[PDB]
Amino acid sequence: WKTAFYAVEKRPMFFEQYEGGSSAWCVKYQFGAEDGGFVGCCEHGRILQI
Amino acid sequence: TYMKIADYGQLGEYTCDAKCDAEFGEPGNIRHLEGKTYDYRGVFCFNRKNLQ
């Protein structure tokens, strides 16, 4: 797996209050994260199935 | 000239707490007015020796 697959990390989770829309009762929080992954050459590795 | 506030209506009520907006009321008016000034004048005439 050190060469079969790869995971790319860009930005961890982030959280912040969304000023606007919040009318002093409906406090609206917004969050999210960004990352991804992909495969190397899918030859270094196999899968045992029935 | 001058101004004088006539009135100003209500601008909100009890707002059914399970709710997250507000409302609008009816404001009043200002009614700028003014006032003039009047005059009075008079004349007369006499003699000279008759006043002696």
Side-chain angles (χ1 to χ4, degrees):
Chain A
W1 311 98
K2 282 315 161 188
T3 175
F5 212 80
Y6 300 94
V8 60
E9 195 283 299
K10 171 184 178 181
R11 180 154 92 261
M13 314 196 59
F14 60 90
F15 294 77
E16 81 285 354
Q17 179 43 43
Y18 177 71
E19 282 84 2
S22 56
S23 66
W25 317 288
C26 290
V27 67
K28 188 184 309 301
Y29 266 101
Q30 189 163 51
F31 69 82
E34 304 75 17
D35 60 51
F38 64 96
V39 69
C41 82
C42 47
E43 324 309 313
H44 306 286
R46 301 96 59 84
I47 45 185
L48 193 46
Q49 192 176 3
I50 309 296
Chain B
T1 203
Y2 65 96
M3 308 172 194
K4 64 105 175 181
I5 46 172
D7 73 312
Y8 41 93
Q10 40 74 32
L11 48 87
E13 59 271 56
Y14 291 171
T15 51
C16 72
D17 179 76
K19 173 51 68 182
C20 187
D21 60 356
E23 275 271 18
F24 303 97
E26 278 63 34
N29 49 4
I30 305 311
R31 287 293 306 274
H32 169 85
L33 275 302
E34 84 275 27
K36 68 190 292 183
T37 303
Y38 300 95
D39 60 354
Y40 70 91
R41 183 175 291 114
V43 290
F44 50 88
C45 79
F46 288 163
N47 192 343
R48 209 68 51 97
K49 44 174 273 304
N50 296 145
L51 273 291
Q52 289 333 104

